[PDB]
Amino acid sequence: ARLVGVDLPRDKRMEIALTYIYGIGRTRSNEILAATGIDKNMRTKDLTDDQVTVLRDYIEGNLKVEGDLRREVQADIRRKIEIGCYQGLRHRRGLPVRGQRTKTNARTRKGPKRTI
Amino acid sequence: GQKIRIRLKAYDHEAIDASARKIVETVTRTGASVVGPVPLPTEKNVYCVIRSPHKYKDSREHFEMRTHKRLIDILDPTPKTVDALMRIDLPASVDVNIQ
Amino acid sequence: PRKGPAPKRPLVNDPVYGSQLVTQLVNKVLLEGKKSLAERIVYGALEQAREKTGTDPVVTLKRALDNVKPALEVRSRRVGGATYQVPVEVRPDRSTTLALRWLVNFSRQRREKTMVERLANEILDASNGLGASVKRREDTHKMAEANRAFAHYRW
Amino acid sequence: GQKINPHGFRLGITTEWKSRWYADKQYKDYVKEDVAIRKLLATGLERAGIADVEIERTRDRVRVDIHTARPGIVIGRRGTEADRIRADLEKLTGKQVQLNILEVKNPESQAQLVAQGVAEQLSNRVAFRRAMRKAIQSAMRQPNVKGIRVQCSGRLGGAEMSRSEFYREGRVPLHTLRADIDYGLYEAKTTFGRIGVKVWIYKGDIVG
Amino acid sequence: AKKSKIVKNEQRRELVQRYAERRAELKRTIRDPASSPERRAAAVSALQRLPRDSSPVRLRNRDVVDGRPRGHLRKFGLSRVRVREMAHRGELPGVRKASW
Amino acid sequence: PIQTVGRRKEAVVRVRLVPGTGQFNLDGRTLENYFPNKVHQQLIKAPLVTVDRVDQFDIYAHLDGGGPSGQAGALRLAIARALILVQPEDRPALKKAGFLTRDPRAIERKKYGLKKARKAPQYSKR
Amino acid sequence: PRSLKKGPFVDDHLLKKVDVQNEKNTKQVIKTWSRRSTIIPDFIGHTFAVHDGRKHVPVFVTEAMVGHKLGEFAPTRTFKGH
RNA sequence: AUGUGGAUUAAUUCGAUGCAACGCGAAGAACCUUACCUGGGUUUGACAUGCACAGGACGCCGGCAGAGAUGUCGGUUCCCUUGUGGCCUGUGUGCAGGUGGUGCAUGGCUGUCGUCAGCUCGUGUCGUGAGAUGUUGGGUUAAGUCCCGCAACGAGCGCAACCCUUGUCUCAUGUUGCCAGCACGUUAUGGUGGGGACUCGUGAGAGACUGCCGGGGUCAACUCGGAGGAAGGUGGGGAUGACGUCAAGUCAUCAUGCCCCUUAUGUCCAGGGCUUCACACAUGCUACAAUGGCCGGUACAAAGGGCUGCGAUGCCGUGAGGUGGAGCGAAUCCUUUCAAAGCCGGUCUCAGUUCGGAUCGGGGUCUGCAACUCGACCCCGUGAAGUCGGAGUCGCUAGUAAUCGCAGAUCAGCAACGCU
RNA sequence: AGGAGGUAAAAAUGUUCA
């Protein structure tokens, strides 16, 4: 939201702190910290700067992160689907693309409720 | 020589016990030694059926096929005994397996 | 139970303290058949109370029970019009059960980030005569004494 | 309908199986050709007194022991009928077929046959009450029995409304297991549909 | 059930017995292993051109008595209804009421 | 020698009792590595405590089937039966304590229409 | 889905229909009934009229839709609202 | 998630509508199934069988067109003994065929009141009679169970019992199952020789019957308590559903009277739909967390399933899974030497969180001709609502509820969180 | 066996043939 290598993403362990990034979960955090030489049991308050630099350059060289990844997602949706594919029609109308009961419970896409 | 491992399967414990008794009687008549009709476990193939043809899932009938099993290891093999067990007749409700 | 009263199940005596009562507390703390965990919880809370006050934790527990257990209870009765609350004498076993239940539930309500901690502290401030369990007891007695007029139904 | 089949109730204690063989993987097609057999000789010679169709088979042979009241109708003059049905069963074979017939001693005491008779007699002209009473009389006069129950259900007397009427004599303890309660069922054909005739015959308890 | 449906299931059975000598199995055992040179074969086209009824994926298991698709039991070749009837009547060896 | 058996909720145990210290050989393990729960241990040692023969006998065993509590109850029964065989005159005390009674309780079978052998479905009137 | 080792699935009818259109360099519409046949990087320009449940549904293929199964471009159901 | 209503739809097949419909028929909707829609074909038909037919082929194998049905081509295309039986060929004729209608015409099957304990009959008696009595009364019982009385005497269906399973113990029994006592194993364990000791399996049998003791009670049923016993009083649970009701449900398992279609209301194929979605109901799963999440280690199960099926070690993958196929028709082998919750330790430290896992993007695997509609699973990423739920409402009396996982049927695959 | 009085507040209706 402000930084890729947020100097304090949140004061807590690294394995779980790096997951405060739109392209990092628990296993990416673990494999990152393994490829580096950084413990995972250590909080972010106890960081250094060189740690942040190696993390930043590793990430920028290996995998994707907030802005570029989110743009990849939205561009995937729009462009690669199209105006009028099936998954695109259902993205457009705000409904579950992957095959789901729309009859009863598609609320995560449809919204809270519009009872008539 | 080699002992042999006559395996008896059926759906009726008294019929299969009768078959095993007949078999031990045969091999003892023709002069062999047997460990006995060891009573193997019984298979219990259960099936749940809806009683009604259209509805009423909560009304079932449970049908079991209770397959009984004995095994007969006869020692001291002899072609006498082999032909004896070849020519002994047993009911269709009992399956024999020679090994 | 129309035919009659059922048998009260015989509780086993705890080996760590020798107490039907701590066994009862275990059975009330229990959830999902997690008896071993409930034993761990109760043992931990008792040993925490021991570390706190430097005495016998079963005795502290019995003191909390003495401060929490009610002698009176209002039982509803739908008399014509609105419902009438009727004070009645609580049996000893009923008082004990209510006390343990209130301890466990008010502990589950309160907040110390660990059932052991919050149970121990509830036991302790009830032993002193402060906690929400004793508050429940006192409110119960207040309600009964208010409704003592309707005691003459005595059913 | 609430009552279970008495046979299915007392299937391993009093009654026994009308198919006496064993199989593991040939069970399915065994059952297939068995039901085909029963359908065949239920459609063919219904005029005969077919009661039981006890089948056995051991890997090359099928015994088709049927039980009948009119062997003269089972087999033709020089057994030409028996040879014909042997032929079509040897088509629908378990690789060889043999068809020793059995004569029942008591068509009045056999539940399926009593129901067969009631079914044929009632449709043409006799009243269901007459038929039921006649069957009950014959059965109880037959000495082995201890009781009988008859139940005719359907458009009785060509009525516009289905009726289920039952008669009985003696004892018919269906909830009791140690009871040779022979059961029989038949769907009498009628110009106004079909009439279900059930028969229960308690011919005494059973030994252990 | 419908006689057309019953005989159609048996037709697909015959088709499977005909076109499954290896004409539907050599294909799949060619496609599975990693040494498959089928990049030049493309006999998946041949498998398409085969009848879809030649595949046992279309093979429905009807009852043999009446043709009921659903409620079928493989051990018997029968629907639940006929299993009930015949097990009561004593026509299914070993099958009796279970009570326990 | 002296062998007994115990059963409790489909948990079988075979007990070879011998004279020794209060040591256990529950399938090559001890009374704490097997049954670390003090309640289970109490349940095991209850008969020996009632007869006042703690530490008189070593107990080898072949716990098989069932879970911890079933196995513990089975072993309780088995050692009680062993104490009967080695000293019948302690029979009244153990019989009063209820260590000879094999608890016949078992899992009640699930039943059709229900969910849990007594848990019926949620019954709505509408 | 559709394991890579087995390769893409394209009904042979549509294949013999489109390969000739390629090698003769004509791009008349193809009346192919089956949908289900994954678009492959062979016919971006040619138009198909796949869904025959109830409508013609032409579809001009592009670069952007290769690999996608042709029926995604041919909605079978119809919903406009209440 | 699943089912339903309604609304959509070309179709969203049909049935089920309080209790007793709504994870129901569906114990397995991608095509099939499928009955529905659009379109393409077909018509004695997809299957039959009797009659006149002229043949030796019928038919199978391939090719081409077609979405396919199928059509059109080319191969290979009868025995029998002269009359043939079979096979088709058509002319058709009969007719088949209808998951087309009426479950208020029906059988069968089922539910349900209710496993409630009641419902009846003969004879006799009372009454003009419908009817009553019996079957009421006192007591007892889980019970119209039993006793004492009684114009009733009796009987029958139901109750109970006989059956299964579980619970204790004996006799036999040792295999593939067990391992006390011997040895061999030295890895990896009853693993192997061995042994019946123990268990276990499975055959038979004993056992619980108020049988015994004490007290109450008609001195009777029966009851309270105790002994002994594994169990004490229908031991626990199943199976078992009287006469009958609800013109309950099913003409869509089947069968079926009557009615209707017979170039179609049949039938083949393809596609699509049964999976829609502004919504509402219902049954469940997963949760909202610390009695917890994650990580590591470590234990204890039962029951069941497996032949064109289980599928092992080993190897490759992160992992679904691929490879290969040992060994097993299975007390052996496989389903890890089967668990999970659990126990120990570590970490998180009350946050929309390392909760929650939906939804969504990408990349895959497996099934199958084929996963767009419309499968499951895996991986990476995303990380929604949800802070224990208004009125109201449901289940449960003990190995129960609550929780944990396991297996099976259907089934290629699964939408199974369901059912058993 | 011998011996005062009580309380349930209100709480409606039911197309068809039957």
Coordinates of N, CA and C (backbone and C1' of nucleotides) in Angstrom, one line a residue, chain B residues 55-59, chain F residues 124-126, chain H residues 3-5 15-24 111-112 248-249 281-282:
Chain B
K55 N -40.1 -43.1 -2.0 CA -40.0 -42.1 -1.0 C -39.5 -42.8 0.2
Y56 N -39.5 -42.1 1.4 CA -39.4 -42.7 2.7 C -38.0 -43.2 2.9
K57 N -37.0 -42.3 2.7 CA -35.6 -42.7 2.9 C -35.4 -43.2 4.3
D58 N -36.1 -42.7 5.3 CA -35.9 -43.1 6.7 C -36.4 -44.4 7.0
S59 N -37.0 -45.2 6.1 CA -37.4 -46.5 6.3 C -36.6 -47.5 5.5
Chain F
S124 N -38.4 -29.9 11.7 CA -39.2 -28.8 11.5 C -40.7 -29.2 11.3
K125 N -41.6 -28.4 11.8 CA -43.0 -28.6 11.5 C -43.4 -28.0 10.2
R126 N -42.5 -27.2 9.6 CA -42.8 -26.4 8.4 C -41.6 -26.3 7.5
Chain H
rG3 P -29.2 -30.8 -5.7 O5' -30.6 -30.8 -4.9 C5' -31.1 -32.0 -4.3 C4' -32.3 -31.7 -3.5 C3' -33.4 -30.8 -4.2 O3' -34.1 -31.3 -5.2 C1' -33.1 -30.2 -1.9
rU4 P -34.8 -30.3 -6.3 O5' -35.8 -29.4 -5.4 C5' -36.9 -30.1 -4.8 C4' -37.7 -29.2 -3.9 C3' -38.3 -28.0 -4.5 O3' -39.5 -28.3 -5.3 C1' -37.3 -27.3 -2.5
rG5 P -39.9 -27.3 -6.6 O5' -40.5 -26.0 -5.9 C5' -41.5 -26.2 -5.0 C4' -42.0 -24.9 -4.4 C3' -42.2 -23.7 -5.4 O3' -43.5 -23.8 -6.0 C1' -40.8 -23.0 -3.7
rG15 P -45.2 -33.5 -12.0 O5' -44.9 -34.5 -10.8 C5' -45.5 -35.8 -10.9 C4' -45.0 -36.7 -9.8 C3' -45.1 -36.3 -8.4 O3' -46.4 -36.4 -7.9 C1' -42.9 -37.2 -8.8
rA16 P -46.9 -35.4 -6.8 O5' -45.9 -35.6 -5.6 C5' -45.9 -36.8 -4.9 C4' -44.8 -36.9 -3.9 C3' -45.0 -36.0 -2.7 O3' -45.7 -36.6 -1.7 C1' -42.8 -35.8 -3.6
rU17 P -47.1 -36.0 -1.1 O5' -46.6 -34.7 -0.4 C5' -47.3 -33.5 -0.6 C4' -47.0 -32.5 0.5 C3' -48.1 -31.4 0.7 O3' -48.1 -30.9 2.0 C1' -46.1 -30.4 -0.1
rG18 P -49.2 -31.4 3.1 O5' -48.4 -31.3 4.4 C5' -47.1 -30.7 4.4 C4' -46.7 -30.4 5.8 C3' -46.3 -31.6 6.7 O3' -44.9 -31.9 6.5 C1' -47.7 -30.1 7.9
rC19 P -44.5 -33.4 6.7 O5' -44.8 -33.7 8.2 C5' -43.9 -33.1 9.2 C4' -44.4 -33.4 10.6 C3' -44.5 -34.8 11.0 O3' -43.3 -35.3 11.5 C1' -46.5 -33.7 11.6
rA20 P -42.2 -36.1 10.6 O5' -43.1 -36.9 9.6 C5' -42.5 -38.0 8.9 C4' -43.4 -38.6 7.8 C3' -43.9 -37.6 6.8 O3' -44.1 -38.2 5.5 C1' -45.7 -38.4 8.0
rA21 P -42.8 -38.3 4.5 O5' -42.2 -36.8 4.5 C5' -43.0 -35.8 3.9 C4' -42.3 -35.3 2.6 C3' -41.0 -34.6 2.8 O3' -39.9 -35.4 3.0 C1' -42.4 -33.3 1.4
rC22 P -38.6 -34.9 3.8 O5' -38.2 -33.6 2.9 C5' -37.6 -33.8 1.6 C4' -37.3 -32.5 0.9 C3' -36.3 -31.6 1.6 O3' -35.0 -32.0 1.4 C1' -38.1 -30.3 0.9
rG23 P -34.2 -32.7 2.6 O5' -33.3 -33.8 1.9 C5' -32.2 -33.3 1.1 C4' -31.2 -34.4 1.0 C3' -30.9 -35.2 2.3 O3' -30.7 -36.6 2.0 C1' -28.9 -34.3 1.5
rC24 P -31.5 -37.7 2.7 O5' -32.7 -38.1 1.6 C5' -33.7 -37.1 1.4 C4' -34.9 -37.8 0.9 C3' -34.8 -38.4 -0.5 O3' -34.1 -39.6 -0.6 C1' -36.9 -37.3 -0.3
rG111 P -42.9 -48.9 6.3 O5' -43.3 -47.4 6.4 C5' -42.3 -46.4 6.1 C4' -43.0 -45.0 6.0 C3' -43.7 -44.5 7.2 O3' -42.8 -43.8 8.1 C1' -45.0 -44.2 5.3
rU112 P -42.9 -44.0 9.6 O5' -44.3 -43.4 10.0 C5' -44.6 -42.0 9.7 C4' -46.0 -41.7 9.8 C3' -46.7 -42.2 11.1 O3' -46.4 -41.3 12.2 C1' -48.1 -42.6 9.2
rA248 P -55.5 -40.6 -1.2 O5' -55.1 -39.5 -0.2 C5' -54.7 -39.8 1.2 C4' -53.3 -39.4 1.5 C3' -52.3 -39.6 0.5 O3' -52.2 -38.5 -0.4 C1' -51.6 -40.6 2.5
rG249 P -51.9 -38.7 -2.0 O5' -50.5 -39.5 -2.0 C5' -49.4 -38.8 -1.6 C4' -48.1 -39.6 -1.9 C3' -48.1 -40.3 -3.2 O3' -47.9 -39.5 -4.4 C1' -47.3 -41.7 -1.6
rC281 P -35.6 -17.3 4.5 O5' -36.2 -18.7 4.4 C5' -37.5 -18.9 4.8 C4' -38.0 -20.3 4.6 C3' -37.1 -21.4 5.2 O3' -37.3 -21.5 6.6 C1' -37.7 -22.0 3.0
rA282 P -36.1 -22.0 7.5 O5' -35.8 -23.5 7.2 C5' -36.9 -24.4 7.3 C4' -36.6 -25.7 6.6 C3' -35.3 -26.4 7.1 O3' -35.5 -27.0 8.3 C1' -35.4 -26.4 4.7

